[PDB]
Amino acid sequence: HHHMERVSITERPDWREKAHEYGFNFHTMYGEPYWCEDAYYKLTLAQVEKLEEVTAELHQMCLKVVEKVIASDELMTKFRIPKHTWSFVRQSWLTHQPSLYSRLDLAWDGTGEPKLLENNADTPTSLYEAAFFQWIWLEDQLNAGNLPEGSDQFNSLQEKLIDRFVELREQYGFQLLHLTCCRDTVEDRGTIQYLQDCATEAEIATEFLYIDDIGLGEKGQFTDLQDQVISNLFKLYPWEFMLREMFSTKLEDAGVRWLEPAWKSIISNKALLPLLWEMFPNHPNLLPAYFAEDDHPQMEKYVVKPIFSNVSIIPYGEEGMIVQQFHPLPKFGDSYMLIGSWLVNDQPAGIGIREDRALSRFYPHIFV
Ligand SMILES: Nc1ncnc2c1ncn2[C@@H]1O[C@H](COP(=O)(O)OP(=O)(O)O)[C@@H](O)[C@H]1O
Numbered sequence: 441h442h443h444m445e446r447v448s449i450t451e452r453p454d455w456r457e458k459a460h461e462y463g464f465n466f467h468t469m470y471g472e473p474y475w476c477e478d479a480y481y482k483l484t485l486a487q488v489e490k491l492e493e494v495t496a497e498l499h500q501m502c503l504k505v506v507e508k509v510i511a512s513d514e515l516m517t518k519f520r521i522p523k524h525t526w527s528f529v530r531q532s533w534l535t536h537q538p539s540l541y542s543r544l545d546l547a548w549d550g551t552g553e554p555k556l557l558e559n560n561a562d563t564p565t566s567l568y569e570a571a572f573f574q575w576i577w578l579e580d581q582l583n584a585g586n587l588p589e590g591s592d593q594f595n596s597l598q599e600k601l602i603d604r605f606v607e608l609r610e611q612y613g614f615q616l617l618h619l620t621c622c623r624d625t626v627e628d629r630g631t632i633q634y635l636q637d638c639a640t641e642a643e644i645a646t647e648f649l650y651i652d653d654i655g656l657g658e659k660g661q662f663t664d665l666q667d668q669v670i671s672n673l674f675k676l677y678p679w680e681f682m683l684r685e686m687f688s689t690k691l692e693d694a695g696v697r698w699l700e701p702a703w704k705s706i707i708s709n710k711a712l713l714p715l716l717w718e719m720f721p722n723h724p725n726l727l728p729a730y731f732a733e734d735d736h737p738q739m740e741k742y743v744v745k746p747i748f749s750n751v752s753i754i755p756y757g758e759e760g761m762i763v764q765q766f767h768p769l770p771k772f773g774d775s776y777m778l779i780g781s782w783l784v785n786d787q788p789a790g791i792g793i794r795e796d797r798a799l800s801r802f803y804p805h806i807f808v
């Protein structure tokens with residue numbers, strides 16, 4: 441029993457070439473899901489307003505977590521933030537460094553309350569499909585008459601991303617934005633090029649360069665492929681790796697503003713889950729979660745997750761682990777379904793639906 445349905449649909453005949461034409465590599469890579477459109481998910485307006493409401497509040501609840509964590513060496517330690525980066529992460533929060541985006545993982549089928557599994561607040565995947573590709577899919581399958589006549593979609597990602605980039609340029613001085621990722625990863629997924637086009641629309645000058653193209657200047661500044669100073673850098677590379685990398689002590693004095701900013705390392709951290717539960721006990725959209733090392737109430741079945749990264753249900757031990765009450769994803773046919781609910785800064789911007797056979801695939805949605 442669900443209050444959303446998975447509706448089979450006839451695939452568009454030229455969607456693979458539409459992807460190729462837009463520079464979208466729809467294949468699975470580095471956690472990016474494989475696009476599918478032999479089906480779509482059908483929601484109601486009520487469900488979407490609910491998702492929006494919950495998404496905006498959960499985001500505010502996450503900012504409260506950061507505020508508390510940043511102010512106690514104890515919590516910065518329980519969050520495994522490397523001590524030699526504490527000043528870098530703290531100053532990033534105390535100077536109010538701006539955020540571009542986040543994606544909440546929400547378990548929900550329309551029944552009961554949506555539950556926060558995790559907040560992908562650093563390098564969330566499936567951006568292109570959610571913002572752009574599934575919107576073209578909607579426009580197309582409407583014109584082909586394969587969707588109900590009043591079909592809409594919970595998706596303002598592109599509009600909000602461009603408006604956020606205008607905000608960054610006009611009020612935070614982001615005139616030139618560098619964009620970067622690891623060579624031989626997701627540069628041809630389409631994410632970097634799509635965000636670059638959004639920044640360009642917002643009249644931001646952009647430059648792409650690979651992680652290994654970044655140079656270390658004489659006074660510690662980071663420099664691009666024209667040996668010029670990098671002031672603002674979008675990265676598709678997680679803080680969990682960067683804060684442990686060889687020249688991470690250079691971060692504090694590099695003179696670079698980052699998207700996502702360093703303080704997002706605290707939100708995009710599984711330790712978020714116990715802190716949310718302690719600060720907001722029995723919140724309707726939270727699950728019981730505790731640090732594994734702590735004396736905590738016993739749970740019938742739960743999930744163990746690392747504080748820096750494989751999830752399992754009850755081999756990992758206690759140290760560096762959180763536990764969270766098990767809450768099964770809704771099953772549609774042979775697959776479990778998960779909602780990915782996007783934020784642009786603090787503004788809910790819509791959802792993408794993902795499926796997997798195991799407790800891999802992205803499906804479009806509509807709402808009526
Ligand atoms: N509390 C939970 N109850 C049931 N399933 C869960 C729970 N937490 C995570 N899962 C399952 O594990 C998968 C990965 O968990 P997640 O916290 O999203 O890790 P990752 O950061 O690797 O995506 C989720 O897609 C979901 O299928």
Ligand code: NI
Nearest residue numbers: 457458460461
């Ligand atoms: Ni082509």
